[PDB]
Amino acid sequence: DGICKSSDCIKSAARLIQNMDATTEPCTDFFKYACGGWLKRNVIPETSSRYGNFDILRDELEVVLKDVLQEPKTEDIVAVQKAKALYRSCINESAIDSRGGEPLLKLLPDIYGWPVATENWEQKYGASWTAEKAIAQLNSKYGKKVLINLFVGTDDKNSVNHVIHIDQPRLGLPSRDYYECTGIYKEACTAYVDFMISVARLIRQEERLPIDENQLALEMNKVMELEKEIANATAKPEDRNDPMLLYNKMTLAQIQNNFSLEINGKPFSWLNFTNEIMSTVNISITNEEDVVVYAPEYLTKLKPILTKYSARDLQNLMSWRFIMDLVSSLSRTYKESRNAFRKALYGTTSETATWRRCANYVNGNMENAVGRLYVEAAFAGESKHVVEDLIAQIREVFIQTLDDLTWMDAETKKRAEEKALAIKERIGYPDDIVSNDNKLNNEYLELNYKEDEYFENIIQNLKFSQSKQLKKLREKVDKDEWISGAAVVNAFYSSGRNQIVFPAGILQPPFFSAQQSNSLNYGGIGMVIGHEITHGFDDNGRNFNKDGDLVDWWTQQSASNFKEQSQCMVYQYGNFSWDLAGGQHLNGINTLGENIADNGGLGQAYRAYQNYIKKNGEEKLLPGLDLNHKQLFFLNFAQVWCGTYRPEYAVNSIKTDVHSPGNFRIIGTLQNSAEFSEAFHCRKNSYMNPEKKCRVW
Numbered sequence: 001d002g003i004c005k006s007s008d009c010i011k012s013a014a015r016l017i018q019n020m021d022a023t024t025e026p027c028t029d030f031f032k033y034a035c036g037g038w039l040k041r042n043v044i045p046e047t048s049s050r051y052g053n054f055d056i057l058r059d060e061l062e063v064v065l066k067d068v069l070q071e072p073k074t075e076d077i078v079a080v081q082k083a084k085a086l087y088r089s090c091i092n093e094s095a096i097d098s099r100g101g102e103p104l105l106k107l108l109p110d111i112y113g114w115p116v117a118t119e120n121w122e123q124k125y126g127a128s129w130t131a132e133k134a135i136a137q138l139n140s141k142y143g144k145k146v147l148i149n150l151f152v153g154t155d156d157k158n159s160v161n162h163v164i165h166i167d168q169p170r171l172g173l174p175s176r177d178y179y180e181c182t183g184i185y186k187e188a189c190t191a192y193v194d195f196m197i198s199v200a201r202l203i204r205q206e207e208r209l210p211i212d213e214n215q216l217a218l219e220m221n222k223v224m225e226l227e228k229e230i231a232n233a234t235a236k237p238e239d240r241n242d243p244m245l246l247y248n249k250m251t252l253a254q255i256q257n258n259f260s261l262e263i264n265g266k267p268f269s270w271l272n273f274t275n276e277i278m279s280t281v282n283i284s285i286t287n288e289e290d291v292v293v294y295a296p297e298y299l300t301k302l303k304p305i306l307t308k309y310s311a312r313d314l315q316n317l318m319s320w321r322f323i324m325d326l327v328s329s330l331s332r333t334y335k336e337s338r339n340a341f342r343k344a345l346y347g348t349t350s351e352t353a354t355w356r357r358c359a360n361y362v363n364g365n366m367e368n369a370v371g372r373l374y375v376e377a378a379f380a381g382e383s384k385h386v387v388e389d390l391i392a393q394i395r396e397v398f399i400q401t402l403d404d405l406t407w408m409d410a411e412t413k414k415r416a417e418e419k420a421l422a423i424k425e426r427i428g429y430p431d432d433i434v435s436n437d438n439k440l441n442n443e444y445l446e447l448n449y450k451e452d453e454y455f456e457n458i459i460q461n462l463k464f465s466q467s468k469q470l471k472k473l474r475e476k477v478d479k480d481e482w483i484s485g486a487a488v489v490n491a492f493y494s495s496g497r498n499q500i501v502f503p504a505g506i507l508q509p510p511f512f513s514a515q516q517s518n519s520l521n522y523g524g525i526g527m528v529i530g531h532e533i534t535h536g537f538d539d540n541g542r543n544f545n546k547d548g549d550l551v552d553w554w555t556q557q558s559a560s561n562f563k564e565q566s567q568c569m570v571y572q573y574g575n576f577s578w579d580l581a582g583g584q585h586l587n588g589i590n591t592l593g594e595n596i597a598d599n600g601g602l603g604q605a606y607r608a609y610q611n612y613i614k615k616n617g618e619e620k621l622l623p624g625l626d627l628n629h630k631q632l633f634f635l636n637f638a639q640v641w642c643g644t645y646r647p648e649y650a651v652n653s654i655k656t657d658v659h660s661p662g663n664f665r666i667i668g669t670l671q672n673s674a675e676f677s678e679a680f681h682c683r684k685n686s687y688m689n690p691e692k693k694c695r696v697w
């Protein structure tokens with residue numbers, strides 16, 4: 001007969017049919033054709049800003065984590081006992097509620113206090129207050145970066161070393177655009193300041209202090225007028241997309257003489273500020289210390305901003321940026337204060353289940369311990385080798401494709417083949433989290449969790465996470481380190497390591513399964529592999545060589561052609577209007593690197609499936625679907641992205657997500673795919689088959 005009738009063929013067909021909408025013409029709108037069935041069935045949960053195939057698999061992963069973390073076992077090693085202890089302290093909301101804001105009150109004296117919730121702040125803290133010491137205490141002990149973001153990272157131009165970086169800090173709101181505070185941003189700006197006052201009023205109440213509502217509004221609006229200035233001083237993402245132009249190496253000498261700051265009437269000392277941070281880990285810094293400055297323009301515009309503000313004005317913002325994140329770890333009364341702010345940025349009317357939030361927290365701070373339990377329970381050993389093979393097939397397809405690229409000269413292709421051949425693959429999980437108990441126990445040896453003290457535990461993880469990062473300055477980059485835990489539904493690429501990673505969490509349907517049809521595997525995990533490989537060659541990754549160093553290996557002509565070729569995708573996606581975002585246009589520049597990966601990866605997966613058919617021949621067709629296997633390749637790729645957004649978060653993500661929305665990743669990459677238009681016999685100049693097609697890789 002020629003029809004597959006296995007248990008896995010039937011699960012796939014059912015999932016494929018239930019998600020699609022065959023009453024739509026594939027060539028008019030393939031997103032609706034592949035996801036219409038799913039969109040009609042589902043509605044975004046009240047706790048979700050975004051919902052789709054990825055979000056469902058992640059909520060499903062959270063269930064597996066609940067199972068493994070919630071029941072102790074007598075044979076559990078210490079590394080596992082600590083994860084479960086942390087989980088339990090997090091889900092005991094009665095123990096957290098009984099403490100109110102007390103944990104925060106003990107903590108405020110350690111960060112020079114919060115003026116608005118303090119009395120005679122200038123007399124108490126203004127004496128010993130210096131921007132150097134104030135900013136340094138938040139960075140070094142709690143990893144919170146408020147005015148200058150100094151961090152220890154890998155040297156872009158020497159991937160085996162670490163160096164100190166100076167960069168502009170994050171903001172309270174999702175992006176710099178929000179600080180216009182008009183139209184689509186007004187509600188968020190309002191809830192943001194209201195959020196300040198609510199928290200300030202709860203702290204004063206709990207300290208039995210007098211509450212002057214007009215004094216609160218006055219102080220917290222000054223905080224907003226201040227962050228507006230800092231926000232407007234920051235560089236657009238568009239002006240930070242070239243890592244060559246962004247890397248500026250200086251000494252603390254050059255930095256002091258080229259970026260001075262007058263704060264609270266006192267000059268800023270970069271050596272005093274730096275040593276205030278590094279001394280936390282018994283490390284000394286001299287004025288010949290090398291530094292990488294990522295936001296030199298920001299530092300320049302910062303100088304006249306901070307002269308106009310007092311030490312009190314500055315502290316009210318700095319402490320607030322830390323208190324933002326801690327209120328959700330306090331009692332219900334403090335959690336409630338974040339409601340209007342969360343609704344405004346994410347559109348959610350309630351918070352995610354406590355155990356869901358907690359499971360995620362333990363997975364993010366103990367990724368190797370949790371990954372161990374996740375793979376033991378939910379990952380199959382068979383699949384690890386099948387994916388290794390898929391990566392080999394796709395790596396070669398990328399290399400062979402170089403011969404056919406006409407916008408590149410021979411010498412540049414040769415250098416490209418080098419990087420490709422040198423990409424390090426990481427599949428599933430590192431074996432030693434399951435087999436080396438000693439190494440795993442030692443990773444968390446200096447952590448000790450009290451079960452009735454969840455706030456002490458999160459603060460401990462902040463100190464352990466920042467301390468661990470600061471003592472890497474004089475150390476070599478550990479090559480064995482994975483760039484992701486195993487209990488993750490995603491994949492990644494590191495340019496500094498030239499490494500692609502595919503955690504266990506993403507090695508499941510619809511992406512991959514050793515028993516489902518190959519057409520679905522290539523169109524699923526295959527496309528994702530090519531995506532991660534092509535990240536080494538996008539507008540950002542192409543600037544790094546085979547060893548992870550930010551060095552030029554492109555001829556003047558090939559580089560000019562890359563920009564020329566990629567400019568097509570800039571215009572394509574920048575013309576897509578997103579109704580959920582208010583008919584705004586996508587930022588084709590900020591999303592270029594991801595669209596390059598999407599278009600390249602899909603084309604590379606299809607060629608690998610063609611090559612597979614060549615060797616092994618056709619596959620047994622799926623039941624219930626009047627579709628051939630080439631059409632199923634594109635259908636599964638499309639259903640990987642089924643989903644929708646809340647309008648509040650479409651406004652958030654269109655400015656902050658470097659990815660295109662799920663629907664435009666489908667329309668965009670297929671519009672540029674002739675192989676798609678062949679599989680579905682799309683007439684020329686139909687929406688899905690425009691004559692003008694972009695291509696890079």
Ligand SMILES: CC(=O)N[C@@H](CC(=O)O)C(=O)NC[C@H](CC1(C(=O)N[C@@H](Cc2ccc(O)cc2)C(=O)O)CCCC1)C(=O)O
Pocket residue numbers: 050051052053054055490491492493528531532594641643644658659662
């Ligand atoms: C600014 C920046 O560089 N970020 C990098 C960080 C890094 O590389 O270190 C980043 O995000 N990397 C992960 C990402 C993974 C992929 C993805 O698209 N993941 C979606 C998942 C999603 C999609 C829709 C939805 O409704 C819900 C979830 C996402 O997380 O947004 C998985 C397959 C294709 C790429 C990639 O490799 O690009």
Ligand SMILES: *[C@@H]1O[C@H](CO)[C@@H](O)[C@H](O)[C@H]1NC(C)=O
Pocket residue numbers: 088092094095452
């Ligand atoms: C929660 O914490 C309280 C106070 O420490 C304790 O009495 C109670 O047993 C805890 N509950 C659980 C389920 O651990």
Ligand SMILES: *[C@@H]1O[C@H](CO)[C@@H](O)[C@H](O)[C@H]1NC(C)=O
Pocket residue numbers: 229232233301
């Ligand atoms: C924002 O900064 C620019 C310089 O970067 C300046 O010209 C402009 O006046 C600033 N806008 C506001 C509202 O301060």
Ligand SMILES: *[C@@H]1O[C@H](CO)[C@@H](O)[C@H](O)[C@H]1NC(C)=O
Pocket residue numbers: 130132272273275276279
């Ligand atoms: C930075 O200067 C302050 C004086 O304001 C001093 O107390 C502190 O010890 C200095 N930090 C160093 C030298 O690391």
Ligand SMILES: *[C@@H]1O[C@H](CO)[C@@H](O)[C@H](O)[C@H]1NC(C)=O
Pocket residue numbers: 570571572573574575585588
């Ligand atoms: C839309 O495409 C045209 C044609 O290339 C281009 O000139 C224009 O800049 C694009 N629009 C956006 C917003 O990118």
Ligand SMILES: [Zn+2]
Pocket residue numbers: 531535594597
């Ligand atoms: Zn990507």
